[PDB]
């Protein structure tokens, strides 16, 4: 019952807008119970902040990797768009 294994990920984009958008487009829908795993995300200036909390390392590993995949996809798309 305690969400006390935590990880925070900070992701610097080039602009405040790019981070805002990233945040808006990131729509995590984990397969993990909310009682076990929670994710909060937001941006400040050009940085995206993603805070995970989990009951243990097993759950965390599953949850974090998956979200990082989403974020990479959003970075790829932004790479394509800003270069035309």
């Amino acid at each position: 019952k305690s969400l006390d294994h935590t990880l925070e990920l900070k992701i610097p984009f080039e602009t405040e807008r790019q981070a805002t958008i990233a945040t808006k487009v990131l729509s995590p829908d984990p397969i993990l119970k909310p009682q076990d795993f929670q994710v909060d995300y937001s941006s400040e200036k050009n940085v995206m902040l993603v805070q995970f909390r989990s009951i243990d390392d097993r759950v965390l590993r599953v949850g974090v990797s998956s979200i990082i995949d989403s974020i990479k996809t959003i970075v790829e798309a932004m790479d394509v768009l800003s270069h035309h």
Binding site: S2, T6, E8, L9, I11, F13, R61, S65, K72
Partner: protein
């Protein structure tokens, strides 16, 4: 600045992570960070499992006998 991560657990452990276009690099760096995190957490699980005896069996063994 690079992407970074910080991990914290109730056994007193704190762990920092730090690792073509700007965004292209960004994406590879995230791939490297993701591997670090996965490597680190897997290791934490491997040590937690090694710290047990075999008492998964023994635990269930009692519950059964208690039923009989």
């Amino acid at each position: 600045k690079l992407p970074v991560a910080q991990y914290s657990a109730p056994d007193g452990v704190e762990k920092s992570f730090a690792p073509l276009t700007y965004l292209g690099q960004l994406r590879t760096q995230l791939t490297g960070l993701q591997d670090d995190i996965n490597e680190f957490l897997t290791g934490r699980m491997e040590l937690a499992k090694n710290k047990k005896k075999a008492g998964a069996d023994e635990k269930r063994i009692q519950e059964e006998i208690n039923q009989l």
